Amino acid sequence: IGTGFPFDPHYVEVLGERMHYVDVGPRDGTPVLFLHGNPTSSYLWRNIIPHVAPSHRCIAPDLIGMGKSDKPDLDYFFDDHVRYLDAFIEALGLEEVVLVIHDWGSALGFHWAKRNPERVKGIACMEFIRPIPTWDEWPEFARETFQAFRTADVGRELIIDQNAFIEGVLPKCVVRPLTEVEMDHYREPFLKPVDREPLWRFPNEIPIAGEPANIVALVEAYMNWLHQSPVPKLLFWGTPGVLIPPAEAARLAESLPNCKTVDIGPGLHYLQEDNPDLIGSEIARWLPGLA
């Protein structure tokens, strides 16, 4: 699995801040928009993009506060990410798009799709944000830790002071062992502790047992849109998974219209680090059928 990032940097000024993004493949035609989540960046898509770039334009931004994008002093609530990504998409003049999304990138992509349905030609997703009804449904190996991330004072000490999302969650949620060069790429944006604010706000925004109520309402709304939408969907899943275990992927294969599911083999949350070649080759084979 490759460790390099052979992509020229591109920058665009959005809402007073510079955002970094990858932009490869043809300069025209329907673009494929890749959206990462917590605590990653466009580096998470480095081995998937090469399977797609020969046939389609590939665009992969780093969310505000992350990767090579600027890091303003924001609270980093979900709504801040919604504003910056909405402005990024308009600055590039995108019209119709295909979405490839993960984790908080999936909450951003599904929320954008619900608001701009006529502009989404297909959605490839994996390990995406959905309402988790009870803590029983969160997997045991990660339950107490996520509960601690959401406990006053304790969570900030773990994520901000100790960098637990990068040092702990990331490698423990990839089945194969990550290398030093890959982990140092993921550590680079967060060498200043104060910049770890988004990494702590994200787990505190996950809709679990009805809290926080504002995010639960937003996610219930895009899930209701997704269940009624005829847009083509491609869902990758792994065993045992984290947000989308095998039994959940089997339920979604029925309840999401026009959905093809792909079993990637062993995987926890960052599926792209366990089987990037199958994820990229299956997206490349599925895209032509969308025309």
Side-chain angles (χ1 to χ4, degrees):
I1 288 168
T3 63
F5 192 72
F7 304 105
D8 287 351
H10 298 268
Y11 297 97
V12 63
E13 202 69 29
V14 177
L15 309 177
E17 303 293 325
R18 192 175 70 164
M19 287 186 69
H20 171 263
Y21 63 104
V22 171
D23 187 356
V24 297
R27 298 295 79 219
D28 58 7
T30 307
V32 184
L33 179 66
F34 297 79
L35 306 178
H36 74 84
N38 192 32
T40 62
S41 65
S42 56
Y43 187 73
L44 182 67
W45 304 111
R46 72 197 181 283
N47 298 135
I48 292 170
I49 287 169
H51 288 270
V52 182
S55 66
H56 287 76
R57 185 176 176 192
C58 292
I59 302 173
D62 291 344
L63 298 184
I64 195 65
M66 309 188 72
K68 291 182 187 178
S69 289
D70 282 352
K71 304 191 180 58
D73 178 22
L74 314 181
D75 289 311
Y76 291 99
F77 282 99
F78 180 67
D79 187 62
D80 290 317
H81 287 290
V82 170
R83 292 193 295 128
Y84 279 83
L85 178 66
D86 275 355
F88 174 83
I89 290 170
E90 297 310 305
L92 299 202
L94 308 189
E95 281 62 19
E96 304 174 307
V97 304
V98 173
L99 294 174
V100 174
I101 64 190
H102 184 223
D103 186 61
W104 284 101
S106 70
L108 287 164
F110 289 138
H111 185 56
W112 190 87
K114 179 200 69 178
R115 298 178 293 136
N116 298 278
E118 76 292 348
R119 291 165 70 186
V120 180
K121 178 172 178 176
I123 301 177
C125 58
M126 58 214 76
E127 280 287 313
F128 70 81
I129 296 288
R130 63 183 176 97
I132 299 298
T134 64
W135 281 107
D136 305 39
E137 291 202 50
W138 190 277
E140 189 286 324
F141 84 102
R143 193 185 300 145
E144 286 169 296
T145 295
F146 276 75
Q147 286 167 350
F149 292 166
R150 295 167 64 98
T151 296
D153 304 316
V154 171
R156 290 182 72 85
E157 293 163 15
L158 289 165
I159 292 171
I160 301 172
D161 302 342
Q162 295 171 34
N163 209 13
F165 225 100
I166 290 283
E167 297 297 331
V169 179
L170 173 59
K172 291 278 177 54
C173 291
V174 176
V175 177
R176 62 97 173 176
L178 294 180
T179 69
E180 295 298 291
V181 62
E182 292 167 322
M183 280 293 299
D184 284 339
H185 268 275
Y186 286 123
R187 285 164 180 134
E188 192 49 63
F190 305 111
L191 300 176
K192 289 169 61 178
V194 70
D195 291 330
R196 300 164 190 169
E197 195 66 24
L199 315 188
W200 170 84
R201 183 54 69 175
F202 275 140
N204 279 277
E205 293 277 74
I206 297 169
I208 305 172
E211 298 180 50
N214 67 310
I215 300 298
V216 169
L218 179 152
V219 175
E220 290 288 0
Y222 70 58
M223 290 304 300
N224 274 346
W225 174 77
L226 192 72
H227 287 297
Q228 298 297 323
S229 176
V231 69
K233 302 170 197 66
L234 179 66
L235 172 62
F236 297 90
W237 61 277
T239 298
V242 172
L243 300 179
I244 306 293
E248 176 63 14
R251 289 179 293 257
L252 290 168
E254 301 191 357
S255 68
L256 298 181
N258 296 322
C259 186
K260 178 183 177 315
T261 64
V262 178
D263 182 355
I264 72 131
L268 287 158
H269 184 59
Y270 305 90
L271 306 187
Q272 304 93 332
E273 296 293 6
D274 279 304
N275 195 170
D277 288 330
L278 184 66
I279 296 168
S281 63
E282 287 293 304
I283 290 165
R285 298 178 191 299
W286 165 83
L287 294 167
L290 305 182

